[PDB]
Amino acid sequence: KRTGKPADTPDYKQVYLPYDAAPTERELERERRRFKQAYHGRMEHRKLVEVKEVPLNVYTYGKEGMSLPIAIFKDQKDPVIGPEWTYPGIYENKIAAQHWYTEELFDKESKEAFESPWQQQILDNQVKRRMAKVMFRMRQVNMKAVDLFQKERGS
Amino acid sequence: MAPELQLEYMPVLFTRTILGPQGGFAGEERLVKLEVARKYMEAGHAVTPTEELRRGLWCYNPDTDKYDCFIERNEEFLDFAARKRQWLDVYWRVNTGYLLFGRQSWGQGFLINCPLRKRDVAQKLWEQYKVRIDPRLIEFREKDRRTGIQELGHNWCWLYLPGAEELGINREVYDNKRVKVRIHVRKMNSMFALY
Amino acid sequence: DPSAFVSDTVKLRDDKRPYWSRRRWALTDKFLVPKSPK
Amino acid sequence: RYYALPHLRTGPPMPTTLEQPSGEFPWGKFSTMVGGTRIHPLYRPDGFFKDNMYPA
Amino acid sequence: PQMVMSRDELKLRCEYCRFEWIHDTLCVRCPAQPSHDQREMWLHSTWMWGKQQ
């Protein structure tokens, strides 16, 4: 929908340099060439997908000294991305913020091995999302019979 | 030898574990038909039992899908293979076989006036398939528990084959505990029927 | 001990479909089409 | 030739570690509430908008 | 009302639709949108033996 979408797109401003050692442009290519391909899905169906809009500079993309164009107020200065360790639980998220297929989390819990302590909570919230899916129709089937997938799909 | 006399069937060692009534599991020497033996051997799933192949063999696990499971056939393997075969021999004798049954029927709809039970299903097994099992391993369908079998035509029943996880029976049968025992009840007059 | 896994339990009355409950009526749905033999 | 089962040397009559997957579609008795749930009336669940909104 | 073959082929299509008994014959009535009415096909409300089996 065309509602709640930016009708303009300002640019990035790079405030301070995250490094003092300037890269050779071959380093700027060899890191970028590493980025253009990424993995999608984590299970038996897992497919490499090529990534659109891979930045010119990998070293300076998100990790410090860049001011985001997410500013809102008048006196709001574009927020400068700080150092990594000052952002809480980021290293802990990198472990656990990833697509977790249910089967796969489950097997980890059974083997009593979790990459992060949090993947308990990652599992518990998946189950609750699934069962909700079950609990919704059971409030909908009550009021009127709703038959799953008998209608013609598309045109 | 001759093009006229062809071996009725020829001895074969197995590499794969094959599903059907002809095919065996990996490592056992079984003599099967010509046309099946050639189609197993040319596909590399079966070898001619030379002596050093009777001692040890390169079979495969389906996980790795390469022939790296080495089995050496010692005494404790051969009694294992004996028991395994005489399990799935009973398995592939009974479902492959179809036990012809005939009896007398009076009245209107297609009912036997002497319904079947578990002591004479097990009887037909011995009569024409020479299969000896304890009759208490048989269980009927839900509809046929209450009245017996009793209806003309095609009926099926279930035989419980108890011991196999010792033999590692999996995926080479349709299921590890059961055989569909197939009965057909034909109505015949007083001349040819019993009871 | 054969009878441990062999089930003879004769079910006398066939269990019916719950028309007195709206949700269990549609959740117990049997998708089946009656066909007489040709 | 007569055909008969081998004896039991070791292990259980019905395969335990070798179970065939059971062929039903696995709907939990408590996940789909239909039958076979014998729940004491003290323990009755899912009233969140009826009586379990005013608990105890 | 449309006559379903048996009780299993009988569904509640709307919010206001109900199960009701027409003299031992199970049927479905909607006070709104009467085209949703379903009868289980069964014997007539009045039948004799020779007249109806």
Place this chain on the structure above:
Amino acid sequence: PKTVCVEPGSNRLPEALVVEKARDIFGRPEFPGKRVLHNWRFFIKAGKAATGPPVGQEFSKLGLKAMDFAKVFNDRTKPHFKEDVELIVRIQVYFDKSYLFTIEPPPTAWFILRALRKKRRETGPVPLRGHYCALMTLEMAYEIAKMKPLCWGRPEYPLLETRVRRVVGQARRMGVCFIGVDTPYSSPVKDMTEQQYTEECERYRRIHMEQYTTLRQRELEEAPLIERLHRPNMSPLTDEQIEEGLRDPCLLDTLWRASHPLSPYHRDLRERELARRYLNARGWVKDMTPEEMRIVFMNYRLPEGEKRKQMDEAAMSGEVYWT
């Protein structure tokens, strides 16, 4: 060369000015307690509230003159705001046909499309296309998630490390590629060896773990008391035990009594030992020392501090009704 705050994990809130004026404009009118007949939501630009089709129609739909809300919203929203920022405005209309509107920061889709330098219809779900849209670091996700709290009164809650995943996963859902996550490695550091990066990681992650831990500790301390009570684990129960425990009440409440912290009131060996043996009559968990019963059964989403507090006889020995 400069690095702003080099300290272990205090970049949490945004700066002062943004926080306090986001307090006095994005805000909560208190719920009057009436019967709400309309909960309306709009996306309205900062400087312009109009009597045009959506808001004018829905206010004339009730017969309400729409000019007043428009004027009040323009008076409240025209100052303090940069242009072309579409805001969430939730208007709640009660049975007196008097209303209260809340002003809320733009939706997460807006922030993501800003931060990715992407206009509308430039990004979609991955299987729909078969290629990722723009790369994003988890650094950027925090400064997106910083902006949306639950309550501006208290910015800390909910905690970033959790609610960031909502942003990460929604961006995910948008088709955004990621760095920390969905690719094996972390964006290269010019000046350090890989083992230096990882050694930094292994201390930093546990530092953040400790900080998070104490944070949700005082979180739980602000809370009402009933969360500090005993909800035992049901998973360690052998599933037939659970269902037969649901078949009769006594198994579960004897269980609850048996596995409980040793607090003055519930620490009784006389009523405990016969409880344990009453459980062990029926084949319930029997390999148990009671003190490992107090470990296996405890509230698992309860944080580490107060759970070692409850495990410890000393710290809980002190809570006693005086008089």
Place this chain on the structure above:
Amino acid sequence: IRQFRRYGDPRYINNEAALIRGQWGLITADFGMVTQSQMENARLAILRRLPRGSFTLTMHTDYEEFPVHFAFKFTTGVPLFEIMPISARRLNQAEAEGIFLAGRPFIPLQTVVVPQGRVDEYHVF
């Protein structure tokens, strides 16, 4: 060629419990003869109800055709259709059966919907 009335008789019950490679399958429960046109009708009616983005309908037509007109003589337990996934979409039983429900009527004899792997013919029958 020029086969008599009693040939390839479907009437026996088979020992082969089929193995369906697709995520779901439609399987013959009775004996009968099925026309090709009936299976084409079934196929189209089923393809109306499939999410073609995630799924592919596989029809097993490789069985012999018997003279009547050429049709199929089907034994119990012979698989017909297969719902094969192109992605992670996992159907329930209600959904899969709701899909095959479209194409069931065109087929003249009774059919069962069976889940991935080997037919458990204790449960089906």
